[PDB]
Amino acid sequence: KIEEGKLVIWINGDKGYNGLAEVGKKFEKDTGIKVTVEHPDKLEEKFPQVAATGDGPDIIFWAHDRFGGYAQSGLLAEITPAAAFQDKLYPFTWDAVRYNGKLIAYPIAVEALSLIYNKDLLPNPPKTWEEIPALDKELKAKGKSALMFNLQEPYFTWPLIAADGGYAFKYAAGKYDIKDVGVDNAGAKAGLTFLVDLIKNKHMNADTDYSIAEAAFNKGETAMTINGPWAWSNIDTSAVNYGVTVLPTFKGQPSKPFVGVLSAGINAASPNKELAKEFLENYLLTDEGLEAVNKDKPLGAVALKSYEEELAKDPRIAATMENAQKGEIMPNIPQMSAFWYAVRTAVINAASGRQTVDAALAAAQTNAARAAAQLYDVMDAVPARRWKEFVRTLGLREAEIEAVEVEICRFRDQQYEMLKRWRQQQPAGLGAIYAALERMGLEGCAEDLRSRL
């Protein structure tokens, strides 16, 4: 049970948690309610484990996509901000914290990919994707490349794919249509084809990952890269004088990067829901308080208009917000994991030639909502000899283990049926798989499996 009359806040260690504790002490001085800020490791996965038992912090700070898994299991309380208060934040940020028509969190920061260019190598960055092939040739003579970014994660490839009509799931009313996928339309085909053509014409390498791309730009080897505000810190310790601008257009249409919103949710089992609402709306989500945490460690672009026009004087933050408003809200539904699985396979296969563009996107279209691939990954991430112990630690009842064992003959088929029946009784996103592997003493399997999501 949670201590009543007290606020416990959980925020990641990479955020300004000292500045947040400053706003909590100011809240304690005016109300007499102690606000303790904690930054536990593996924070996004211990919260749903402790919140499932009715314990945990009163407020949780994390990206909005994970809050969909929390809300579908009922771990986050519905918030009721006044219509005048909702007007104080940018309108699209409220779309990222809405689940089943209910608002489940308060938006804090806004995050999106931007085009990062070397100002010394490139005083006038290209406005369109189509200028890049020609400039790369004029630049490859001098030993450098025009553009280098992570081609291994579809998150970095999506802005081009979505520019001319691509999308994950269509959002209408207050729901995502899982049977309306937009990775196989003409817009996605053209975007992925342009990317593959860049590789076939040897303007990019299909094997370029995140570490290769960041090192090449920070050492002046390439003129441009595609990255978010999280990478700004490494570029300043580097000797490169860089700028951050809008992403290039494709067929006259803007690039559409996925938008992530740092959000603050309230524990559904917290007896201090009203005190938490008072702290977030009146003390944190103001120009001061948001500045208090920003001076500890920057937030980048924020959802508060008044303080963002403040932060937007930084042209890099202004480009982050501009690319965000041209982009798409990252959906918070569980099918987004299968979407990433399907799209990552498609981009990698199309970039390597294993699949044609339309065959890769046709497969990703069908696989976009199929979750089987993630369950089969779990089966090969756990030693076969420890499977029943792993299934037991996950919480699958013994009566269910025995029911699968007596009717299913082969070993692999038993494993999948157990995981399938466990998934139908406990929905994903609560970190139960990783939590189960750590208690089994298999922290290497958990760590290695956790890094691949």
Short mmCIF file of C-alpha atoms in Angstrom, two decimals:
data_model
loop_
_atom_site.label_atom_id
_atom_site.label_comp_id
_atom_site.label_asym_id
_atom_site.label_seq_id
_atom_site.Cartn_x
_atom_site.Cartn_y
_atom_site.Cartn_z
CA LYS A 1 0.00 0.00 0.00
CA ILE A 2 1.06 3.59 -0.71
CA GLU A 3 1.63 6.09 2.09
CA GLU A 4 -1.31 8.50 2.30
CA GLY A 5 -0.60 12.20 2.61
CA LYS A 6 2.71 11.88 0.75
CA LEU A 7 3.86 12.05 -2.87
CA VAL A 8 6.41 9.59 -4.28
CA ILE A 9 7.56 10.48 -7.80
CA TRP A 10 9.46 8.19 -10.18
CA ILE A 11 11.44 9.76 -13.03
CA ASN A 12 14.29 8.35 -15.10
CA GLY A 13 17.86 9.06 -14.06
CA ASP A 14 18.68 10.86 -17.31
CA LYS A 15 16.12 13.58 -16.49
CA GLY A 16 16.57 16.54 -14.17
CA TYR A 17 15.43 14.72 -11.04
CA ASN A 18 17.10 17.24 -8.71
CA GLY A 19 15.17 20.09 -10.31
CA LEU A 20 11.96 18.08 -9.93
CA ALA A 21 12.70 17.58 -6.23
CA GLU A 22 13.01 21.37 -5.99
CA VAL A 23 9.44 21.78 -7.24
CA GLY A 24 8.41 19.05 -4.80
CA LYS A 25 9.88 20.91 -1.84
CA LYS A 26 8.15 24.12 -2.92
CA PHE A 27 4.97 22.04 -3.03
CA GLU A 28 5.76 20.71 0.45
CA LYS A 29 6.33 24.22 1.82
CA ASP A 30 2.91 25.45 0.68
CA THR A 31 0.92 22.30 1.54
CA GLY A 32 2.90 20.26 4.08
CA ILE A 33 2.99 17.24 1.74
CA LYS A 34 6.43 15.67 1.40
CA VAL A 35 7.33 15.06 -2.25
CA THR A 36 10.19 12.56 -2.59
CA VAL A 37 11.67 12.09 -6.07
CA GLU A 38 13.25 8.74 -6.91
CA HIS A 39 15.07 7.57 -10.05
CA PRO A 40 15.16 3.76 -9.88
CA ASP A 41 16.90 1.69 -12.52
CA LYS A 42 14.72 -0.27 -14.97
CA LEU A 43 12.05 2.23 -13.94
CA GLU A 44 9.54 1.58 -16.73
CA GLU A 45 9.40 -2.12 -15.76
CA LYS A 46 9.40 -2.03 -11.95
CA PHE A 47 6.44 0.39 -11.85
CA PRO A 48 3.90 -1.97 -13.50
CA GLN A 49 5.19 -4.83 -11.34
CA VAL A 50 4.72 -2.92 -8.09
CA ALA A 51 1.60 -1.09 -9.33
CA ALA A 52 -0.03 -4.44 -10.09
CA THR A 53 0.08 -5.23 -6.35
CA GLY A 54 -1.35 -1.82 -5.41
CA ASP A 55 2.02 -0.26 -4.49
CA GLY A 56 4.47 2.06 -6.20
CA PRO A 57 4.88 5.80 -6.66
CA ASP A 58 2.01 8.24 -6.86
CA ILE A 59 3.31 9.75 -10.13
CA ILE A 60 5.32 8.07 -12.90
CA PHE A 61 7.32 9.96 -15.54
CA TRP A 62 7.91 8.15 -18.84
CA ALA A 63 7.33 8.29 -22.58
CA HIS A 64 3.69 8.12 -23.62
CA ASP A 65 3.87 4.85 -25.58
CA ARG A 66 4.42 2.75 -22.45
CA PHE A 67 1.45 4.44 -20.75
CA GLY A 68 -0.92 2.65 -23.13
CA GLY A 69 0.12 -0.71 -21.71
CA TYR A 70 -0.27 0.65 -18.18
CA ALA A 71 -3.72 2.09 -18.87
CA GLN A 72 -5.09 -1.04 -20.54
CA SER A 73 -4.27 -2.94 -17.34
CA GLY A 74 -5.74 -0.08 -15.30
CA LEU A 75 -2.52 1.05 -13.62
CA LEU A 76 -3.01 4.77 -14.40
CA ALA A 77 -5.80 6.99 -13.12
CA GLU A 78 -7.92 9.20 -15.35
CA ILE A 79 -6.99 12.87 -15.02
CA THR A 80 -9.50 15.72 -15.21
CA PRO A 81 -7.70 18.93 -16.21
CA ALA A 82 -9.92 21.95 -16.74
CA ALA A 83 -10.63 23.10 -20.29
CA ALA A 84 -8.70 26.30 -19.57
CA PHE A 85 -5.69 24.26 -18.43
CA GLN A 86 -5.74 21.99 -21.49
CA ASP A 87 -5.53 25.13 -23.63
CA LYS A 88 -2.19 25.97 -21.95
CA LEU A 89 -0.51 22.96 -23.61
CA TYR A 90 -0.08 22.29 -27.31
CA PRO A 91 -3.17 20.49 -28.68
CA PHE A 92 -1.43 17.48 -30.24
CA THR A 93 0.33 16.63 -26.96
CA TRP A 94 -3.04 15.73 -25.42
CA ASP A 95 -3.59 13.18 -28.21
CA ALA A 96 -0.51 11.27 -27.01
CA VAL A 97 -1.88 10.89 -23.46
CA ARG A 98 -5.40 9.75 -24.43
CA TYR A 99 -6.41 6.09 -24.15
CA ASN A 100 -9.94 4.78 -24.77
CA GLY A 101 -11.18 8.37 -24.90
CA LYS A 102 -9.80 9.09 -21.41
CA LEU A 103 -6.78 11.26 -20.69
CA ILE A 104 -4.35 9.23 -18.57
CA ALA A 105 -1.34 11.53 -18.19
CA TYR A 106 -0.10 15.12 -18.39
CA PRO A 107 2.23 15.94 -21.31
CA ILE A 108 5.63 17.35 -20.34
CA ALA A 109 8.20 17.26 -23.15
CA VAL A 110 8.01 16.77 -26.92
CA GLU A 111 10.57 14.70 -28.83
CA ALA A 112 11.07 14.07 -32.55
CA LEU A 113 13.79 13.44 -35.11
CA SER A 114 15.42 16.36 -36.90
CA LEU A 115 17.94 16.89 -39.69
CA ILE A 116 21.40 17.58 -38.23
CA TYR A 117 23.88 19.09 -40.69
CA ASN A 118 27.52 20.16 -40.54
CA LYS A 119 27.52 23.94 -40.94
CA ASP A 120 31.17 24.05 -42.05
CA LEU A 121 30.70 21.32 -44.67
CA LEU A 122 27.24 22.56 -45.64
CA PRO A 123 26.02 26.16 -45.18
CA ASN A 124 22.65 25.57 -46.95
CA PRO A 125 21.07 22.21 -46.08
CA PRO A 126 18.83 20.63 -48.72
CA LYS A 127 15.10 21.24 -48.41
CA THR A 128 14.17 18.05 -50.30
CA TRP A 129 15.27 14.42 -50.22
CA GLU A 130 15.76 14.57 -53.99
CA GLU A 131 18.69 17.02 -53.75
CA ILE A 132 20.68 14.51 -51.69
CA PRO A 133 21.80 12.15 -54.53
CA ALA A 134 23.35 14.99 -56.54
CA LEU A 135 25.03 16.65 -53.56
CA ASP A 136 26.42 13.30 -52.37
CA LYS A 137 28.26 12.84 -55.68
CA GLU A 138 29.70 16.37 -55.57
CA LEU A 139 30.66 15.59 -51.95
CA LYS A 140 31.92 12.02 -52.41
CA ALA A 141 34.76 13.33 -54.58
CA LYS A 142 36.06 15.16 -51.49
CA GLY A 143 35.98 11.86 -49.55
CA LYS A 144 32.85 12.62 -47.49
CA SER A 145 29.21 11.56 -47.76
CA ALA A 146 26.09 13.70 -47.80
CA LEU A 147 23.88 11.74 -45.40
CA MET A 148 24.38 8.90 -42.91
CA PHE A 149 21.79 7.66 -40.42
CA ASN A 150 20.63 4.45 -38.75
CA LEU A 151 19.16 2.15 -41.41
CA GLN A 152 18.74 -0.69 -38.89
CA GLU A 153 15.83 0.80 -36.90
CA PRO A 154 12.61 1.75 -38.76
CA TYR A 155 12.13 4.64 -36.32
CA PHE A 156 14.84 6.49 -38.26
CA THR A 157 13.57 5.34 -41.67
CA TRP A 158 9.89 6.11 -41.01
CA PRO A 159 9.94 9.91 -41.71
CA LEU A 160 10.71 9.28 -45.38
CA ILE A 161 8.33 6.31 -45.69
CA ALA A 162 5.43 8.27 -44.19
CA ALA A 163 6.11 11.50 -46.12
CA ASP A 164 3.96 10.69 -49.17
CA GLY A 165 1.21 8.72 -47.44
CA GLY A 166 2.60 6.06 -45.13
CA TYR A 167 1.17 5.51 -41.66
CA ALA A 168 1.05 2.84 -38.97
CA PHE A 169 -2.61 2.57 -37.94
CA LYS A 170 -5.35 5.00 -38.93
CA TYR A 171 -6.64 6.96 -35.93
CA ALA A 172 -10.33 7.89 -35.94
CA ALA A 173 -12.73 8.56 -33.06
CA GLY A 174 -10.64 7.63 -30.00
CA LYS A 175 -9.25 4.35 -31.32
CA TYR A 176 -6.67 3.01 -33.74
CA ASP A 177 -8.04 0.79 -36.52
CA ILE A 178 -5.82 -2.29 -36.26
CA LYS A 179 -7.13 -3.56 -39.61
CA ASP A 180 -6.26 -0.29 -41.41
CA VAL A 181 -2.48 -0.38 -41.88
CA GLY A 182 -0.74 2.09 -44.16
CA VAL A 183 2.68 0.55 -44.77
CA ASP A 184 1.68 -0.88 -48.18
CA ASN A 185 0.11 2.16 -49.86
CA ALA A 186 1.62 4.10 -52.77
CA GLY A 187 3.18 6.65 -50.42
CA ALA A 188 5.12 4.06 -48.42
CA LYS A 189 6.17 2.28 -51.62
CA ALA A 190 7.63 5.48 -53.08
CA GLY A 191 9.41 6.46 -49.87
CA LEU A 192 10.98 3.04 -49.37
CA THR A 193 11.89 2.88 -53.07
CA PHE A 194 13.74 6.20 -52.83
CA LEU A 195 15.66 4.83 -49.84
CA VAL A 196 16.54 1.61 -51.68
CA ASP A 197 17.55 3.63 -54.75
CA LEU A 198 19.93 5.65 -52.57
CA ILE A 199 21.54 2.36 -51.52
CA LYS A 200 21.61 0.81 -55.01
CA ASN A 201 23.24 4.00 -56.31
CA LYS A 202 25.75 3.69 -53.43
CA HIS A 203 24.74 6.96 -51.79
CA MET A 204 24.17 5.10 -48.51
CA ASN A 205 25.18 1.76 -47.00
CA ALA A 206 22.56 -0.75 -45.87
CA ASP A 207 24.76 -1.70 -42.89
CA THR A 208 24.97 1.79 -41.35
CA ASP A 209 23.67 1.60 -37.78
CA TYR A 210 23.33 4.18 -35.00
CA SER A 211 26.89 4.01 -33.64
CA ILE A 212 28.41 4.13 -37.14
CA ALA A 213 26.28 7.12 -38.13
CA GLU A 214 26.90 9.12 -34.95
CA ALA A 215 30.66 8.57 -35.15
CA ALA A 216 30.82 9.54 -38.83
CA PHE A 217 29.01 12.85 -38.30
CA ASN A 218 30.84 13.78 -35.09
CA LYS A 219 34.17 13.23 -36.88
CA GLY A 220 33.20 15.31 -39.92
CA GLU A 221 33.07 12.29 -42.23
CA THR A 222 29.48 12.98 -43.34
CA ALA A 223 27.61 16.24 -43.86
CA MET A 224 24.20 15.23 -42.47
CA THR A 225 22.57 12.78 -40.09
CA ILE A 226 19.09 12.12 -38.72
CA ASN A 227 18.82 12.06 -34.93
CA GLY A 228 16.83 13.43 -32.02
CA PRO A 229 17.71 15.89 -29.25
CA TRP A 230 19.18 13.06 -27.16
CA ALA A 231 22.22 13.03 -29.49
CA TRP A 232 22.92 16.77 -29.16
CA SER A 233 25.20 16.22 -26.16
CA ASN A 234 27.70 14.01 -27.98
CA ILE A 235 27.97 16.42 -30.93
CA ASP A 236 29.07 19.37 -28.75
CA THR A 237 31.83 17.41 -27.04
CA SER A 238 32.78 16.68 -30.65
CA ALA A 239 34.47 19.42 -32.65
CA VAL A 240 31.67 19.68 -35.24
CA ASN A 241 29.81 22.98 -35.54
CA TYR A 242 26.32 21.75 -36.42
CA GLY A 243 22.82 22.99 -37.02
CA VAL A 244 19.41 21.42 -36.51
CA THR A 245 16.77 22.07 -39.18
CA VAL A 246 13.54 20.68 -40.61
CA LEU A 247 13.66 17.26 -42.23
CA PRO A 248 13.84 17.29 -46.04
CA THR A 249 10.63 17.00 -48.01
CA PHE A 250 9.79 14.07 -50.30
CA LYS A 251 7.61 14.65 -53.37
CA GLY A 252 6.85 18.09 -51.93
CA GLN A 253 5.45 16.58 -48.72
CA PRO A 254 7.10 16.96 -45.31
CA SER A 255 8.87 14.08 -43.63
CA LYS A 256 6.70 12.58 -40.87
CA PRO A 257 8.77 11.48 -37.86
CA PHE A 258 7.21 9.73 -34.90
CA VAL A 259 6.55 12.02 -31.93
CA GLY A 260 7.24 10.88 -28.37
CA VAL A 261 5.78 12.82 -25.44
CA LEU A 262 7.29 12.58 -21.97
CA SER A 263 4.25 12.29 -19.72
CA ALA A 264 3.31 12.19 -16.03
CA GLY A 265 0.76 9.59 -14.96
CA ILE A 266 -0.98 9.04 -11.63
CA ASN A 267 -1.03 5.63 -9.96
CA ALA A 268 -4.54 4.19 -10.05
CA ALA A 269 -3.93 2.76 -6.56
CA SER A 270 -2.64 6.06 -5.16
CA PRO A 271 -4.83 7.57 -2.41
CA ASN A 272 -3.31 10.99 -3.23
CA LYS A 273 -4.77 11.53 -6.70
CA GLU A 274 -6.00 15.03 -5.86
CA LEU A 275 -2.68 16.04 -4.30
CA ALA A 276 -0.86 14.71 -7.38
CA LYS A 277 -3.16 16.67 -9.71
CA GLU A 278 -2.52 19.83 -7.69
CA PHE A 279 1.25 19.30 -7.85
CA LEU A 280 1.38 18.69 -11.61
CA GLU A 281 -1.08 21.34 -12.83
CA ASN A 282 -0.17 24.19 -10.47
CA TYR A 283 3.48 23.60 -9.50
CA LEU A 284 5.23 21.57 -12.21
CA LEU A 285 3.40 22.54 -15.42
CA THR A 286 4.28 26.24 -15.11
CA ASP A 287 7.08 28.32 -16.61
CA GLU A 288 8.90 28.07 -13.30
CA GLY A 289 9.17 24.44 -12.31
CA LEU A 290 9.57 23.48 -15.95
CA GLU A 291 12.58 25.79 -15.88
CA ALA A 292 13.65 24.25 -12.56
CA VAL A 293 13.95 20.79 -14.12
CA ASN A 294 15.33 22.20 -17.38
CA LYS A 295 18.24 23.88 -15.57
CA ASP A 296 19.12 20.53 -13.98
CA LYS A 297 19.11 18.80 -17.38
CA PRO A 298 17.36 20.17 -20.49
CA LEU A 299 13.96 18.82 -21.53
CA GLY A 300 14.26 19.85 -25.17
CA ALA A 301 10.88 20.82 -26.58
CA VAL A 302 8.07 20.98 -24.02
CA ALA A 303 4.28 20.88 -24.22
CA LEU A 304 3.74 24.17 -22.35
CA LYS A 305 3.29 26.87 -25.00
CA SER A 306 4.46 29.79 -22.85
CA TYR A 307 7.73 28.15 -21.81
CA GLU A 308 8.28 26.63 -25.27
CA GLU A 309 8.16 29.99 -27.04
CA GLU A 310 10.78 30.52 -24.37
CA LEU A 311 12.71 27.34 -25.27
CA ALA A 312 12.05 27.81 -29.02
CA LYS A 313 14.45 30.77 -29.14
CA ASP A 314 16.99 27.96 -29.45
CA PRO A 315 16.71 27.16 -33.19
CA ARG A 316 17.47 23.48 -32.53
CA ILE A 317 14.48 23.24 -30.18
CA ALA A 318 12.40 25.20 -32.69
CA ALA A 319 13.29 22.65 -35.38
CA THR A 320 12.41 19.81 -33.00
CA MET A 321 8.93 21.25 -32.44
CA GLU A 322 8.51 22.00 -36.16
CA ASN A 323 9.38 18.43 -37.15
CA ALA A 324 7.09 17.17 -34.38
CA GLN A 325 4.05 19.12 -35.58
CA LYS A 326 4.72 17.81 -39.11
CA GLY A 327 4.97 14.25 -37.76
CA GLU A 328 2.72 11.61 -36.24
CA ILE A 329 1.97 10.72 -32.62
CA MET A 330 3.58 7.43 -31.65
CA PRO A 331 0.63 5.09 -30.96
CA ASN A 332 0.45 3.61 -27.46
CA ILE A 333 -1.40 0.38 -28.34
CA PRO A 334 0.18 -3.08 -27.87
CA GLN A 335 0.01 -3.79 -31.63
CA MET A 336 2.78 -1.22 -32.13
CA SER A 337 5.35 -3.81 -31.03
CA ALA A 338 4.24 -6.15 -33.83
CA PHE A 339 4.26 -3.13 -36.15
CA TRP A 340 7.90 -2.39 -35.33
CA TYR A 341 8.75 -6.08 -35.75
CA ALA A 342 7.09 -6.19 -39.18
CA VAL A 343 8.45 -2.86 -40.44
CA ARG A 344 12.01 -3.45 -39.20
CA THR A 345 12.04 -6.71 -41.17
CA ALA A 346 10.72 -4.91 -44.26
CA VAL A 347 13.23 -2.04 -44.31
CA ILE A 348 16.19 -4.34 -43.61
CA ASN A 349 15.14 -6.81 -46.31
CA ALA A 350 14.46 -4.08 -48.87
CA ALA A 351 17.76 -2.34 -48.11
CA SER A 352 19.70 -5.61 -48.41
CA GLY A 353 17.91 -6.98 -51.49
CA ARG A 354 16.48 -10.06 -49.75
CA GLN A 355 13.04 -8.67 -50.65
CA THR A 356 11.73 -6.30 -53.27
CA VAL A 357 10.17 -3.08 -51.98
CA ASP A 358 6.56 -4.09 -52.64
CA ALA A 359 7.09 -7.64 -51.38
CA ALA A 360 8.66 -6.37 -48.15
CA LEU A 361 5.85 -3.86 -47.61
CA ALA A 362 3.19 -6.44 -48.50
CA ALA A 363 4.62 -8.75 -45.83
CA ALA A 364 4.86 -5.93 -43.27
CA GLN A 365 1.24 -5.06 -44.08
CA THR A 366 0.08 -8.57 -43.16
CA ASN A 367 2.47 -8.93 -40.19
CA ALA A 368 1.74 -5.45 -38.80
CA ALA A 369 -0.82 -6.76 -36.28
CA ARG A 370 0.47 -10.32 -35.77
CA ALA A 371 2.09 -10.79 -32.36
CA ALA A 372 3.30 -14.37 -32.88
CA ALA A 373 6.86 -13.37 -33.82
CA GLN A 374 7.43 -11.79 -30.40
CA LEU A 375 6.25 -14.93 -28.60
CA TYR A 376 8.58 -17.11 -30.68
CA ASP A 377 11.46 -14.78 -29.77
CA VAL A 378 10.80 -15.45 -26.08
CA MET A 379 10.94 -19.21 -26.67
CA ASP A 380 14.45 -18.96 -28.14
CA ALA A 381 15.60 -16.41 -25.52
CA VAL A 382 14.98 -18.83 -22.61
CA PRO A 383 16.89 -22.12 -22.27
CA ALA A 384 14.55 -24.98 -23.13
CA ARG A 385 15.49 -26.82 -19.92
CA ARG A 386 14.19 -23.90 -17.79
CA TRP A 387 10.92 -23.36 -19.67
CA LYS A 388 8.40 -24.64 -17.11
CA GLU A 389 10.12 -22.72 -14.31
CA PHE A 390 10.03 -19.62 -16.52
CA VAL A 391 6.35 -20.13 -17.31
CA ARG A 392 5.59 -20.67 -13.61
CA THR A 393 7.44 -17.48 -12.66
CA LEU A 394 5.46 -15.60 -15.32
CA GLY A 395 2.29 -16.47 -13.39
CA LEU A 396 0.72 -19.09 -15.67
CA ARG A 397 -1.41 -21.29 -13.42
CA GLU A 398 -0.39 -24.92 -13.03
CA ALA A 399 -3.79 -26.08 -14.28
CA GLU A 400 -3.06 -24.29 -17.56
CA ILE A 401 0.45 -25.77 -17.83
CA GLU A 402 -1.01 -29.26 -17.38
CA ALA A 403 -3.83 -28.64 -19.87
CA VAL A 404 -1.36 -27.73 -22.62
CA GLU A 405 0.96 -30.62 -21.75
CA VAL A 406 -1.71 -33.33 -22.00
CA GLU A 407 -3.14 -32.23 -25.38
CA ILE A 408 -0.13 -30.77 -27.24
CA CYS A 409 2.44 -33.37 -28.28
CA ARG A 410 5.57 -31.60 -29.51
CA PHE A 411 7.79 -29.43 -27.31
CA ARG A 412 7.84 -26.16 -29.27
CA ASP A 413 4.07 -26.31 -29.75
CA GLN A 414 3.64 -26.67 -25.98
CA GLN A 415 5.84 -23.62 -25.34
CA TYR A 416 3.92 -21.37 -27.74
CA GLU A 417 0.53 -22.53 -26.45
CA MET A 418 1.61 -21.80 -22.87
CA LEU A 419 2.78 -18.30 -23.80
CA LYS A 420 -0.32 -17.78 -25.95
CA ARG A 421 -2.65 -18.77 -23.12
CA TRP A 422 -0.64 -16.68 -20.65
CA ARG A 423 -0.84 -13.65 -22.95
CA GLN A 424 -4.64 -13.95 -23.15
CA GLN A 425 -4.86 -13.71 -19.34
CA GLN A 426 -2.23 -10.98 -18.79
CA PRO A 427 -1.58 -8.26 -21.38
CA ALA A 428 1.81 -7.10 -22.42
CA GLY A 429 3.77 -4.26 -21.31
CA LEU A 430 4.05 -4.98 -17.66
CA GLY A 431 7.65 -6.21 -17.77
CA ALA A 432 6.64 -9.63 -16.44
CA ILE A 433 8.90 -11.55 -18.84
CA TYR A 434 12.00 -9.59 -17.86
CA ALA A 435 11.04 -9.61 -14.17
CA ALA A 436 10.57 -13.39 -14.32
CA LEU A 437 13.97 -13.94 -15.94
CA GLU A 438 15.80 -11.89 -13.29
CA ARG A 439 14.35 -13.90 -10.40
CA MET A 440 15.35 -17.15 -12.14
CA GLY A 441 18.97 -16.02 -11.97
CA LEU A 442 19.01 -15.61 -15.75
CA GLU A 443 19.89 -11.92 -15.81
CA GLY A 444 21.93 -12.42 -18.98
CA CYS A 445 18.91 -13.74 -20.87
CA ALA A 446 16.74 -10.90 -19.57
CA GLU A 447 19.36 -8.23 -20.31
CA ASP A 448 19.99 -9.56 -23.82
CA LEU A 449 16.26 -9.92 -24.48
CA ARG A 450 15.45 -6.53 -22.93
CA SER A 451 17.93 -4.76 -25.23
CA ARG A 452 15.91 -5.97 -28.23
CA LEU A 453 12.69 -4.02 -27.88
#
